[PDB]
Amino acid sequence: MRECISIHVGQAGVQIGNACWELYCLEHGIQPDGQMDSFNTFFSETGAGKHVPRAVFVDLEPTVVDEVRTGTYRQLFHPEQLITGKEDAANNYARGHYTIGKEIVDLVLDRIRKLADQCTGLQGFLIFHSFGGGTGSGFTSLLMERLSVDYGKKSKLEFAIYPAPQVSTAVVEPYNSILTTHTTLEHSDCAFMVDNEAIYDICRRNLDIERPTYTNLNRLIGQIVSSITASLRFDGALNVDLTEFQTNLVPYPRIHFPLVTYAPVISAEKAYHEQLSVAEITNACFEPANQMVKCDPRHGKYMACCMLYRGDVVPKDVNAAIATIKTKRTIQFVDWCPTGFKVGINYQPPTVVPGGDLAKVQRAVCMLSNTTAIAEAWARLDHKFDLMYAKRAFVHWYVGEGMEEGEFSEAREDLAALEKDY
Amino acid sequence: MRECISIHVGQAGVQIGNACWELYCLEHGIQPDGQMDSFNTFFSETGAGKHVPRAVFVDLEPTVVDEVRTGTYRQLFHPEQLITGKEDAANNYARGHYTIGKEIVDLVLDRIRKLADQCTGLQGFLIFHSFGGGTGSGFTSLLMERLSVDYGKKSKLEFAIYPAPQVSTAVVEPYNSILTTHTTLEHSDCAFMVDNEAIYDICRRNLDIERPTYTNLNRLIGQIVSSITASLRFDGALNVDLTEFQTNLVPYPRIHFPLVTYAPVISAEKAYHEQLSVAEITNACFEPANQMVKCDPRHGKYMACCMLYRGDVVPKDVNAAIATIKTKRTIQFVDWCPTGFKVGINYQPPTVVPGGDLAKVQRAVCMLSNTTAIAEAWARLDHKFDLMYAKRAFVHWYVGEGMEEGEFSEAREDLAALEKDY
Amino acid sequence: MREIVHIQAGQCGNQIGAKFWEIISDEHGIDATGAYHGDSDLQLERINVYYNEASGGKYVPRAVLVDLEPGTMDSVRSGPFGQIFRPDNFVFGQSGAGNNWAKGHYTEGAELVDSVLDVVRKEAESCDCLQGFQLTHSLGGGTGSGMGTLLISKIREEYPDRIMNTYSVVPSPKVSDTVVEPYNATLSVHQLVENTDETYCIDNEALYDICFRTLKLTTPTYGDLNHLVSLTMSGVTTCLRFPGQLNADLRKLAVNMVPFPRLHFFMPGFAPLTSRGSQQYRALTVPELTQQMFDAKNMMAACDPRHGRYLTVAAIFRGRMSMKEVDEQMLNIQNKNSSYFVEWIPNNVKTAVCDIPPRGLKMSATFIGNSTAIQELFKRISEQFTAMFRRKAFLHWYTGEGMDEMEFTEAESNMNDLVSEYQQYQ
Amino acid sequence: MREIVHIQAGQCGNQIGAKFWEIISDEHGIDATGAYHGDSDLQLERINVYYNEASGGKYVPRAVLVDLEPGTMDSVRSGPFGQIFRPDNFVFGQSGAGNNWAKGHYTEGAELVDSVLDVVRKEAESCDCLQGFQLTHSLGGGTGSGMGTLLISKIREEYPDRIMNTYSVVPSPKVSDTVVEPYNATLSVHQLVENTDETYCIDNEALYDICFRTLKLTTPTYGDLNHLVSLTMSGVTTCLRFPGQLNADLRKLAVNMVPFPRLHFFMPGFAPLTSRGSQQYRALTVPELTQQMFDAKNMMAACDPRHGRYLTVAAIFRGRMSMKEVDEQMLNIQNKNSSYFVEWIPNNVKTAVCDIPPRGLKMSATFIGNSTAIQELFKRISEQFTAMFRRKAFLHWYTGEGMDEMEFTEAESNMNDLVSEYQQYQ
Ligand SMILES: Nc1nc2c(ncn2[C@@H]2O[C@H](COP(=O)(O)OP(=O)(O)OP(=O)(O)O)[C@@H](O)[C@H]2O)c(=O)[nH]1
Ligand SMILES: Nc1nc2c(ncn2[C@@H]2O[C@H](COP(=O)(O)OP(=O)(O)OP(=O)(O)O)[C@@H](O)[C@H]2O)c(=O)[nH]1
Ligand SMILES: Nc1nc2c(ncn2[C@@H]2O[C@H](COP(=O)(O)OP(=O)(O)OP(O)(O)=S)[C@@H](O)[C@H]2O)c(=O)[nH]1
Ligand SMILES: Nc1nc2c(ncn2[C@@H]2O[C@H](COP(=O)(O)OP(=O)(O)OP(O)(O)=S)[C@@H](O)[C@H]2O)c(=O)[nH]1
């Protein structure tokens, strides 16, 4: 009925989608084969007892997609939703937007069209990608504008792996980030920033894991998305719709980059000594270091807040904790938004994956905040562009793919305007 | 009772006939010996429990007919139906029309006459041949004028293998194609185009077969013919007669070249995780690339469409899907034909040949449409004629068989008139 | 059923025909005597196309051997498979033209012509239906070219319907084997242009190049070259003699490859041709043959097609193919090699497939190309003829035997007309 | 699927390529012949990148061998893994440039160029998609540098889309192996800067230093040196050939490590490199490798990076790492070594990890560095060229072969411009 269509672009998107789909299949008891009501919101039941996710995997290189084809979930995904290319963008937004994307965007467009034709209550689209990767910027932006012009006001959500100010695999990340942000600002309804270094720190200090691989990061991201989607996939005291997210956390269309936070992130041995309360988890979540974006919110302000509690939490307890923290002077809120809160209570306890770093607990909270600290990073990011543009470094690479030198300056001034809009 | 007469001309006709009759014999459970009520429409039970097809195989070269004599279905035919020539036309319409056909058409005429004398409810004739082949053009044309003058208004159906613009075995295909199209235009009640490269593509990237042989092409063609004839050979909610096709899909007698499409075209590997409904199969069929004729219908318009759904499909579902697609803007219909739809529901599931690429499924759709884009190809074909006639290339070959140079020019202008009729 | 008469002239023609007969017998599984020893019914299904039944369950080839000296035919009789031929078929003179066209066409041929026409008429009428004639000779020698021209003239005035092809061996440009070879070439061409439906040009130097480089053999012999030409011939005829998923015959090739009545000279080519070691390092696939298919190194005709243009191309394959791949391969060849292909013949590539592969090879192909490269060859002969005619060198032999200077003038005029037409259609 | 063509020139190039092929066959589990014997499906998952499936469960490398003398290729044929190569792929000359660039590029290369371009086009078109070309040669010799320059020119004018990397061996500054090596180096560099996307500088003296000191071996051999260079090459390509938690390919390295079209020279580095007894005294951890990658001792370029500055750094790793630790380690490198790193390139370190470790080592790392130290090398060469040009020493050999003094002047001017650009960007 109320289906949602997932898109994964780039290697990061593919890995995150794999983790998310295994997590949901475990949550609904779906076998890797696909066997065993809200599951219809994400998995179509075809023929007899067989179920297939409404997912599309696309990349300009066949490595990760082929690995997914060889994964245990091969019996889950129907073969042709997976898309493979020949030449990767190679950390080049122009390569992934003009060279290869311009002739393979139609394939993913047809895939999502045939998926949407068999769904009647499509709430919106989810996209997972990375700014640093050339594919995850260029092809993401391209398919995003295709979806926007094919749908207009249909809600779309973006999960961008925002490269860290110091952890950035591609040395040309500022160019791709600026270009793709200029390209995606107008039509991406709501993009969520995620910092890899922040996740590393949170995992190492709270979960007390010395050496976590990307598997743990993918577990955390899948848990976040599961907490987000539990409203549609499960009943609750106050269910929240996807349209409400862009209705609440968008004071103005320009500023639509809210960050996310999770609580609690503890090991089982820690979980023995800790009993869960709404107040403790909420104040821990509002603690700046618990956020997976490397920015101090207290350096800015707060424009909106959205708590998502899952489990058995009394609404009076949530109201009391939220009011008490609102009374606290630690966090400042913008004057023209005195009432910028939203609370979603759900009766589904968070799912635990076997071998997972997270420990199964009754209560859990996912927080979404549109703070002002984000612009800070943007400014720094813009500064990086300057340090890589005064010498015109790497310009020839993007010039060779069909760019125009003026577009770089246009994107730079556009993002300067976005920054000073705060 | 309500019999139909099959005719196969040339090697293409012989192979297609072999595949189609083995498919029918499988459908009715007919042994290769011919043993084991609607079967009376194609097989004449004679003597004792022995049924023989009402098929005539004719060729100017005795290769394929002899191969049929040595085939597994040797005892299926009483050996008098198979006809052999001595010298093939060798990709020469003049050779197959004037040299050898003029003195051997009488044999097949007598064969079909005595086959028709023992049938009282003869619906019409199915004819299989290829335009490129000299036999499949010349002998088909000659036999077809003989049938037209011996029967007048009796319905005739043509299954022509329209040579592709670039996949064409004989280099002299344009001359034969133009000549035979001019010669059979007047009598062609309803002729179906089939472009081999289109079947190659449809097999390769839908059935995922890397290296298909004409066996699979013949399987698909036999499936198409079985879907067409299931109305006569089986009951359904809305059965369709052969006269109804030439009644519906002929807005004017001149333009009578509808193309065909099939759905679904998949293997069991995809079929495990895919369900079938009328809407999905119908919108997949309406997609231009699924058509086995290399044209884009969006370049032109639609005059008529006839969809045969075989299996267990609810008529209300068919009506809803057809209305929804009618509301879709991607297909445009001519103004003076607002209601050009025909729907035929049959309760017989599509038969699957053992070892066949196609996977057994409950539902299947065969679509026959009259689109304008076909004229495009004709114009292109006519253009090719000019490129092969301005230098008078290969003229001597046809002059040696008794042609007149004026025939080429009159055929060219006739097909120009056909093209500009659109 | 479409029986074919085999006729060979000269030492080269007779040896090549002998090799071809051993190849055909190997293909049909016939012993060294003539008794049937095939493994499948399809081996004997069209056995009558190249054989006639004989009492005792025997088979004799439908062949006629012609010569002006009794030596090379004696060698063929004493050679391998000497008992398969019925001795009555052999016909030879006692003089020997001695590398003179006039002697081989007007003085010493005027007596053997009656016998050879009688025997070919006997073979034609005694059979069911004569599809055509295949000839084997060379244009350099005396009895070869002259006898071939005389036979084609008489056959054409006798059977104006059946198509005949000549596997004439063009003289090698690198060595003038006979000093008078330009004269023989000119006269043979002047007769073949009208009295022969089509011709294949095969050169010894190209065969040597293939054997040294492509086949990587240190010791080439005439046996190997005759084997290659015989393999080409068998691959050409396998479409008629065996069933195929897309069958073809001699008339199909004639119609496809001939855009004009006088433009009927073709380049044959074979693949695969690998040495002893390379055979285990090549994936025996159709792309592996198409990469060996269109290039000047693999053409056994001494003319580079890249200089000229391909008027038309035909490819006959043998084995287990999914020939939609062959179709798209021809499309790719048209695409990338658009420069070498003529423009006013859309889709100038003809393709046919025969089920049964040749013995020893799971899959192979054969190329028949009509192009303007041979023009160069032809053009060259022209001036060489002039270079040997202005000084009137070696004209005494031809003049004394009944020819005339006007005859050579008319032959050269027609030859120049042919080369001019070839150049004009470029 | 992104197939790669391997081309080797000169004795050094051919030997290094042979060693690299044995290393790759070891990595992919290929026997001494070419039969597949892998233990995991991932070995054959991308086997086609460096191999072609011959008939009958066989694989042959996508390799081409080029030389002007038929000796060292004979050694390759007779050496270990000699039967894996396709014999026809071998291409050899018959004269030998004799350490003369003009002979290896104008006189004796002008005839082998046709054959090598033909074979490289064969390999390119016979494959699905050619990602790029990797070459192996040395600039000191004559046939090596000249053939490499000719091949890169022809390929670049033929394929302006596919990136190519050259593993050229820089002449050793410590000894002038050939008196004319500055000239060959200058000409080869002048061709590479325009017709090559990137180059790696490898010097024999650095490998000797590593063998004696870092590896602690009493007797260095060319086999060990080639083994180290091959290990570097395999570590570079393992990102493409094997799945990785953060995948990469040649285009990724090119885009990340090239800030300007003409500043595309790189330094290789490998870790770990320990003697026999040291392996049990150092833990196999990532910090134990990061301490070993960043030092002038482990750079195979005869130039200390500490004098200059690092433009960019790329680090590929293989094995079992929780690479957030690699991230914070790169942060430590950026922090402590801030002086040695350029300032106008924020976060100038690229990082990638491939899952499968190299055979025999549970975890390893490879380093690719673009810095201003190589400038000195180039700078030094300039004076040597001048020191060998004012006296006009050994100009007769190059002048007589068709070159000119203006050609040397233009090459020296381009070299000076390049070194000036490196100095200016410091
Ligand atoms: N947190 C997290 N990030 C990942 C993961 N996998 C990949 N990434 C991110 O992906 C970035 C690399 O860029 P990609 O999008 O993967 O590049 P690509 O997939 O090769 O596509 P191209 O750049 O166009 O070639 C790194 O900076 C990582 O931050 C993952 O599993 N977890
Ligand atoms: N799709 C398809 N086409 C076929 C098949 N068999 C033959 N053809 C077509 O037949 C054409 C070859 O000419 P034919 O129709 O066989 O002509 P013929 O039987 O040789 O008769 P003549 O031309 O007079 O010699 C090719 O262009 C093919 O398109 C088949 O099994 N499937
Ligand atoms: N391919 C091939 N060519 C041959 C062979 N034997 C001879 N030739 C070629 O045939 C040409 C000579 O033709 P030939 O048959 O000897 O003339 P001829 O007229 O018959 O000679 P004569 O009988 O009057 S003595 C030469 O160019 C030679 O290269 C052979 O076994 N294989
Ligand atoms: N690393 C490494 N370097 C080598 C090896 N063999 C030779 N070299 C280096 O190659 C350089 C000489 O290059 P070389 O290939 O001999 O020139 P050439 O032009 O090919 O010489 P020729 O073929 O004309 S005789 C020398 O500096 C030498 O140090 C080797 O096995 N490993």
Numbering used by the authors:
A (entry chain A), B (entry chain C): 1 to 36, 47 to 432
C (entry chain D), D (entry chain B): 1 to 44, 47 to 360, 369 to 436
What did the article's authors report about this structure?
Microtubules (MTs) are important components of the cytoskeleton networks in eukaryotic cells, responsible for cell shape determination, intracellular transport, cytoplasmic organization and cell division. A pf is formed by head-to-tail stacking of αβ-tubulin heterodimers. The GTP bound to α-tubulin is buried in the α-, β-tubulin intra-dimer interface and is non-exchangeable and non-hydrolysable, whereas the nucleotide bound to β-tubulin is exposed to solvent and exchangeable.
The structure and lattice interaction between tubulin heterodimers in the MTs are highly conserved between the S2 and porcine tubulins. Structural comparison between tubulin dimer in the Tube and MT lattice displays another rotation of β-tubulin, decomposing into a small bending angle of ~2° in radial direction and a large twist angle of ~4°. Third, “the stable state”: the H1-S2 and H2-S3 loops move closely to the neighbor M-loop to form the other side of “MT-bond”. The slightly curved tubulin becomes fully straightened with its both sides forming “MT-bond”.
